[PDB]
Design a protein around this ligand. Structure first.
Ligand SMILES: Cc1cc2nc3c(=O)[nH]c(=O)nc-3n(C[C@H](O)[C@H](O)[C@H](O)COP(=O)(O)OP(=O)(O)OC[C@H]3O[C@@H](n4cnc5c(N)ncnc54)[C@H](O)[C@@H]3O)c2cc1C
Ligand SMILES: Cc1cc2nc3c(=O)[nH]c(=O)nc-3n(C[C@H](O)[C@H](O)[C@H](O)COP(=O)(O)OP(=O)(O)OC[C@H]3O[C@@H](n4cnc5c(N)ncnc54)[C@H](O)[C@@H]3O)c2cc1C
Ligand SMILES: Cc1cc2nc3c(=O)[nH]c(=O)nc-3n(C[C@H](O)[C@H](O)[C@H](O)COP(=O)(O)OP(=O)(O)OC[C@H]3O[C@@H](n4cnc5c(N)ncnc54)[C@H](O)[C@@H]3O)c2cc1C
Ligand SMILES: Cc1ncc(C[n+]2csc(CCOP(=O)(O)OP(=O)(O)O)c2C)c(N)n1
Ligand SMILES: Cc1ncc(C[n+]2csc(CCOP(=O)(O)OP(=O)(O)O)c2C)c(N)n1
Ligand SMILES: Cc1ncc(C[n+]2csc(CCOP(=O)(O)OP(=O)(O)O)c2C)c(N)n1
Ligand SMILES: [Mg+2]
Ligand SMILES: [Mg+2]
Ligand SMILES: [Mg+2]
Lengths: 576, 576, 575
């Protein structure tokens, strides 16, 4: 550790960092020279935006720090979309934003920007290096902030300072606190929750991503109080599989009896969720358990706020919660859930398997069956979120899911898959791409080829901004600016040196997709899908689609559901 | 004009806006519905970053307002790179940044960002619409700010407010002031400049972009005081052609006797330039005429500061400037200029027509000769800046040039060409692309096909981040992270439906390029060039290449020059 | 110039800076040591907010750079109110914001703030020094930015870097461009304005602060086209005095026939004004000449925009403007102006000399007569803005006026007077203070005493937030939170060592104010005034007072006017 660049790389390497995603240039050159000499791999991308998405996806998969790096001015500026996504997803990311020479700061120099100001909204820590010793210190603070769960950390490094001497080791010698504290609730809040539960004749649990390490506790509580369990999109991968109390998801992409179970129960308990669609939530009698107190009551009236961890709160309250022997509400909701899903399959999916262009719901149904039990699925923003929510299951809980569920950016699927795949080349990674999303960052097909990343990019090629076509249908606005001439992604992937398949016949989807998923290397599957595979109830308004309608609602987008119906049916047969 | 969305489009249409570049979505839907009903064309791009670059390039070509538009959160976030470039270039751009519903602001909603804060550095005006009447007002202020020369204007529009009623017309009915005032200098400042000129036995003029409308005045002054004229890269297109006093350019990409003429004259006059490389500038006796007083003395010691327009200042001082009958310095500099260029052609261009892989300087030389006399040239940041500076000329001043000369971003050439070509489809547009730059925004090949834009994309495919390889060579750092496996851009362009040519044999460059430039439609010419076509003097340091070396320098990068030698030679024959 | 602190002070001294207002501490210590060794005077204030107001007022008086300086974190944070005011007023100010040691930046250290981010809104240039050479460079850029008219410049200096070596002199050796370019309009815009003027049978000129160096041109144009001349508050000190076309001011504090002349003329020409009250402006046929093109059309419909200097634009268009021999509109507006002012004096100033508690309008009338012909007047935000506008005149144009007319902060009068008075101790400076404004920065009475600044602080002590009481009256809201127990500012000023007078009897105002203004040294005159000296027409709404009412209006606050009526009457001669 002689220069600050060398010390920064030695510090990252000592903490277990295995790769840095980025694009070399100017102020970043001394850092990449240190990378070359180290055991850290340099992962070259075509656009720095993909490096920030890849680091965010890698972190979500590993639970460890991930790093992206970019050159001065326009170089680090490109990181921004990926940093907002990684930040909203709570990924542990350190972004090395190289900066113009310090002597040029404030002189309107060539490539001058102020990244230390620009990145404030997409980060929990964002400071500028002004010397080697201070640089070592703020590198520690950036790492310690993101490892403590404060979101993205940005370190802004003027290129001349990267070549100055390293600090004396005081801050790089530290052990980073990366543990998970056990957050028990305030007894007063837990007591009010116990009383609310005991006073209620019927209770519904609505779970989000905060339920990640509380499956056993949520299920034990549900068995005791006979409560149906619904979920937000972020809670789907953790609480839906093998759940005897399963009642679906809320929101426009929702399914089953979740909205009804949530609005008809005496008490609704929000468990680790920040579900933003308030019009689907009741206001009369709601409790909320959230580890971040500032998030409580953000989405609806909350009468019983509880600041705490889901598993710890449930373990604390369980001895005081009385066993409810009455299952009437639960049985009634389980039956209504199965009827709603059966009705949805009959209304929108009957005999659709031979319609041309190919129905995307048929593709997603096959994709769910053919993908490995431990595959990583990345989901591009748009109609692919509808197909993932209703057709991609997580049996045994061994699959991983990376998407832009909060920032809602298009084009995330391929760069997220690049990061996810880099962690382990022997694990299957499926990128559910949109044609719009892929075309937005098309040059990342060159990155997949360069690094020989064996991901399977499944393009739902509807030649449309599918989700926008749906919005305009809801508004009543004539279709404009959404659908354009067809693009052949299989030929583009082949021209870039990637094995490709084009699927246009629905009777060939199963076999061609099976062949592609089995191929030992990168594959792009270009599936020509129907952009008009949409069914929207006439009562849905533009205000509802945009998320600002206040009136109570239970209406979801039309369309079918997949393999989730098998659990719904098995739960009906298992009613005592 | 019933809604604010309709009034905004009616206002832009009444001001002569012919097209809006963007990508439809969510909050932007009511605005694009109004576009559909209007005479304005909607130009769909694959990535919103290209819309902001295209609007910037269109404005630089027309001298009128240009408009880009993007959806909420991640949509408008993509505009940022293009807005920094358009802002630094002084383009007249209005960016419509659609925003999340106003009821959701402050609630950490799905896709929430604060564009009104994020865009402050890349704009002269950036405000949020909070109602219809105020929206009409700030739309006027945004347009009036950018039309007055204050740079990019951003109007942040929450989607719900786009559907509310329009204002009463008070601000939309205004005539926008788009005139160019005539800025005469302060008599005290002008008098000190007269004295400095009269006391000097030899004077050199160093011109930048501010000399755009002062060619006659610069030339008249130069004939009176016998002064050689040099230029910054931004002044090249205006002052180099048919200039009997021409002595080249300064900086690392420079050529000819400019650095010598500038440092050896008794007085150096900076005329409309903000040339950032201080180590190439003298400090002892410098005068500076700039229309923005805050820019004076930003780059070197200035003893005679003059706040004013170049043409007006020169016309004011001319009757008081005594005629210099001594041409010794001018003749000496004209001869030294021609010798330096002749030496550079002999040293670096010997057998260039047979060099394999194809020498980029040979390509640029052919390109200059074959392109139309009125073509628009767009230049990708990197080695293409070296080839444009030394080989692409502007005879008669009828050609236009769009590049990222100030913000210095990669990937600008194709999106700049999309904007420039949309102005007039009967005018030739050449995009000098880098392989790095093209791969960074590769999906814009789909935009060229979609809009049938007949631009000629000339890819200097060296399979390298050429400019970074140069930086590492100068530093002494082992080559790492710059060169990767070859990519076939002709096959990618053909797979996207674009006519393409792959050139690998130098003896075929002239014929294949001539055939391609003549084709009536979009063409991608993939030229396999040599990444090692670099000649760097051993004295150049990393500090110099990064722009923070303070010691005086006259050293430029090795390499030849093109057709500029013909004017240098004709000026020798015209010496009395 | 061995250290950056020494070089910074040498550069300021070489540019003619005579004093720096501030408060020494921590990171600012090496800079104040360099001030001590230099010919620059250190002016200690009690609160750094007063240093920024004082620099802003000094600059407005001299037309030159003025400097304020403050310590790290909380020290420079106090500058902020004064910097927003100096910035809105277009003052040429350099703010030296000392900062925490560079090694501590990013570590949540004791006193840590980010002034380089905090001050972006109240400045045209704001950067952080990271080393001696770069510090010299950004010092140049900061000075050159504010001297070119871009507003306040802030230089953020980490204390450790102040002691590191100075730069090599390249940027400090430069000559700063402080000239005034001559901005002629675009011929196309000027030609459209000529046509608009020639087509109009009647024209009104409405002037703001941009008319400062164009009096001769405005008057020559007015004589040619027979146009009445009105003004915004910012234009009052330049265009009202000895004006044969004078028709008053617009807005709620307005007077005379200005609103009528502006809305009844065939063409209204806005000349160097950014008057923000759109409801008083017509929309049908308006032209605007402004040196900053981005300001055109900001307040009303403008059909004839002209980017350019007022004097240059007028000189350029004059040979093409045809002489108007018809004076009908001008005579009708001159007569209506005199009638309106006469009516206002009869209605609201009857028996004002005997009114108890003392009427502030009677005080302002006496103050205008007793103050020197070249006095500087500083005006606290609130009811004092009404009294200054309607009673304080500028005969011969030798008086100066400093106020918070744009940022609208209370408490500016005393600190602005401190800066104005420091320029020349032989010149009279009158601070028209509010009791609210004085109480807000009361510790600056200690600064006046310390520096023996012979300013005359005239406190309009109404025991109220007078302007807020007016707002609640207009809204119909019951009076609450505005009026409190009386404070004796004369006793407080005397306890601080300052000669003071307390005036409670209206019959004593003239003699006590004459004695006080004649006193050779600082004086605080505590005048017990009536907080209910308000006459508000019943149609004035809360939306109007707040500035967001859309409907066209010609209504002004009731109340009299002063010595301005003598010009209105003299202008009626030859009717
Ligand atoms: C096109 C599109 C459409 C969408 N439509 C829908 C839709 O119809 N329905 C839907 O449900 N989603 C939808 N989403 C996603 C939606 O916007 C939200 O992002 C999502 O509902 C949030 O899920 P969540 O509550 O699990 O996650 P988050 O919003 O991340 O909330 C997790 C919460 O748990 C808390 N927490 C974390 N750890 C713990 C712990 N140990 N103990 C306690 N609390 C903890 C956190 O503090 C946080 O408040 C859509 C996304 C896209 C891209
Ligand atoms: C990879 C790369 C390498 C580069 N290398 C070099 C190099 O070696 N050499 C080089 O020269 N450039 C180089 N450049 C560009 C360089 O960074 C600057 O952008 C350029 O030198 C500025 O040119 P300019 O002074 O003409 O333009 P600007 O920087 O835009 O300056 C124009 C000036 O004129 C003033 N002005 C405008 N209108 C008027 C008027 N009517 N009257 C008076 N003043 C007016 C403006 O206020 C401004 O200060 C490089 C760019 C890239 C991308
Ligand atoms: C309590 C209170 C009440 C107020 N009430 C009123 C009221 O009733 N009436 C009123 O009039 N004001 C009122 N004001 C002040 C008001 O808010 C504005 O600040 C004022 O009207 C603006 O005056 P102005 O146009 O002269 O100045 P500015 O707003 O500073 O405008 C000057 C303009 O001239 C331009 N300019 C500058 N130099 C030149 C040049 N050489 N050539 C051409 N253009 C140039 C500038 O670009 C600018 O646009 C009040 C203030 C306070 C504190
Ligand atoms: C960067 C960005 N631009 C725009 C949007 C708005 N948006 C959301 S979904 C969508 C369409 C996505 O099209 P595609 O990726 O092809 O998916 P589809 O819905 O057609 O399956 C758009 C424009 C966004 N979320 N992000
Ligand atoms: C967005 C961005 N990232 C990084 C840089 C730094 N940089 C400047 S030139 C260059 C290489 C450009 O490569 P290419 O486009 O292939 O052009 P070449 O120099 O090889 O001709 C890089 C990385 C930049 N200017 N902009
Ligand atoms: C710092 C600040 N706080 C509050 C206001 C709002 N305000 C404007 S005038 C005024 C009352 C001023 O009272 P005083 O200074 O006593 O003057 P008066 O109007 O009573 O003459 C107030 C509260 C303001 N302009 N600035
Ligand atoms: Mg699609
Ligand atoms: Mg290249
Ligand atoms: Mg008061």
């Amino acid at each position: 550790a002689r220069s600050y660049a060398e010390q920064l790389i030695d510090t990252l390497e000592a903490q277990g960092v295995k790769r840095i995603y980025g694009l070399v240039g100017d102020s970043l050159n001394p850092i990449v020279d240190a990378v070359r000499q180290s055991g850290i791999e340099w992962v070259h991308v075509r656009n720095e935006e993909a490096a920030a998405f890849a680091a965010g996806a890698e972190s979500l998969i590993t639970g460890e720090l991930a790093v992206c790096a970019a050159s001065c001015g326009p170089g680090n500026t490109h990181l921004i979309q990926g940093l907002y996504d990684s930040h909203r997803n709570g990924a542990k990311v350190l972004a090395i934003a190289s900066h113009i020479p310090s002597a040029q700061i404030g002189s309107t120099f060539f490539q001058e920007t102020h990244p230390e100001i620009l990145f404030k909204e997409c980060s929990g820590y964002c400071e500028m290096v002004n010397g080697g010793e201070q640089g070592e210190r703020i590198l520690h603070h950036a790492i310690q902030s993101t490892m403590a769960g404060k979101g993205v950390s940005v370190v802004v490094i003027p290129g001349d300072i990267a070549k100055e001497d390293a600090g004396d080791g005081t801050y790089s010698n530290s052990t980073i606190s990366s543990g998970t504290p056990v957050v028990f609730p305030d007894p007063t809040e837990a007591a009010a929750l116990v009383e609310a539960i005991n006073n209620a004749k019927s209770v519904t649990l609505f779970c989000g991503a905060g339920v990640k390490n509380a499956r056993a506790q949520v299920l034990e509580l549900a068995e005791k109080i006979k409560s149906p369990i619904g979920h937000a999109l972020g809670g789907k991968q953790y609480i839906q599989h093998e759940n005897p109390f399963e009642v679906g998801m809320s929101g426009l992409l929702g399914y089953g009896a979740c909205v009804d179970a949530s609005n008809e129960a005496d008490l609704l308990i929000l468990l680790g969720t920040d579900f933003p669609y308030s019009d689907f939530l009741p206001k009369d009698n709601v409790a909320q358990v959230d580890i971040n107190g500032a998030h409580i009551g953000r989405r609806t009236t909350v009468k019983y706020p509880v600041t705490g961890d889901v598993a710890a709160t449930i373990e604390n309250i369980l001895p005081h919660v009385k066993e409810k022997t009455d299952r009437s509400f639960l049985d009634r909701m389980l039956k209504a859930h199965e009827r709603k899903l059966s009705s949805v399959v009959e209304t929108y999916t009957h005999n659709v398997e031979k319609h041309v262009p190919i129905h995307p719901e048929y593709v997603a149904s096959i994709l769910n069956e053919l993908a490995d039990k431990d595959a990583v699925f990345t989901v591009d923003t748009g109609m692919c979120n509808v197909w993932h929510a209703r057709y991609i299951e997580n049996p045994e809980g061994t699959r991983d899911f990376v998407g832009s569920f909060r920032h809602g950016t298009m084009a995330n699927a391929l760069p997220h898959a690049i990061g996810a795949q880099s962690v382990d080349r022997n694990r299957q990674v499926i990128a559910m791409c949109g044609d719009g999303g892929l075309g937005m960052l098309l040059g990342e097909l060159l990155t997949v080829k360069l690094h020989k990343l064996p991901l399977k990019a499944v393009v739902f090629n509807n030649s449309s901004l599918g989700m926008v076509k749906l919005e305009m249908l809801v508004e009543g606005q004539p279709e404009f600016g959404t659908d354009h001439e067809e693009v052949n992604f299989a030929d583009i992937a082949a021209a870039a040196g990637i094995k490709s398949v084009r699927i246009t016949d629905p009777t060939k989807v199963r076999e061609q997709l099976a062949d592609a998923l089995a191929y030992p290397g990168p594959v792009l599957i270009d599936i020509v899908t129907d952009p008009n595979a949409l069914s929207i109830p006439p009562t849905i308004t533009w205000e509802q689609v945009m998320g600002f309608s206040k009136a109570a609602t239970r209406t979801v987008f039309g369309g079918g559901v997949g393999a989730m119906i098998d659990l719904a049916r098995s739960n009906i047969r298992n009613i005592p």
